[PDB]
């Protein structure tokens with residue numbers, strides 16, 4: 092896919108049903124919610140987190156917090172299925188010592204999208220991003236270090252795991268508006284799990 096990046100297609104197929112069961116479990120404690128950007132806009136993607144740290148938005152800036160700002164309780168613990176799959180994927184991608192302390196769970200309803208951005212809220216750039224696709228297919232945009240660099244368009248299907256780090260750790264990327272459809276395991280949406288090492 093790029094220097095330090097790779098797409099392990101269908102890698103998470105065997106663990107998908109369990110992963111989805113655990114997404115529902117996590118959501119039972121920290122419900123999916125559409126966050127508001129520092130600018131004041133409600134995101135189309137609904138999110139929640141599990142693990143020690145969760146990605147959140149603030150009146151002015153993004154940041155990680157061990158506390159869910161909606162429930163005001165800690166985020167749920169990282170499910171075992173999540174931990175195991177992430178580790179295997181990281182190893183297969185060339186990052187054997189990856190130890191995530193945060194997992195951002197994204198839910199894409201039909202038409203939802205995630206505009207081009209960089210995952211630049213994490214201090215340690217040695218840690219890669221492990222991104223798991225579940226359910227409906229989506230078009231993933233993968234660019235470069237500069238906001239205006241050329242973009243590659245890749246279809247991400249159920250079970251696909253994208254991992255980027257090293258030279259591509261800060262590359263711009265996004266998800267185009269989710270096309271309508273149906274999937275046996277997620278029904279009407281696409282879920283994505285983004286594992287990161289947000290702390291030290």
Ligand SMILES: O=C(O)CCC(=O)C(=O)O
Nearest residue numbers: 195197210222266283285
């Ligand atoms: O849904 C995806 O495949 C991308 C999610 C993403 O870029 C993020 O959570 O930072």
Ligand SMILES: [Fe+2]
Nearest residue numbers: 208209210264
């Ligand atoms: Fe991202």
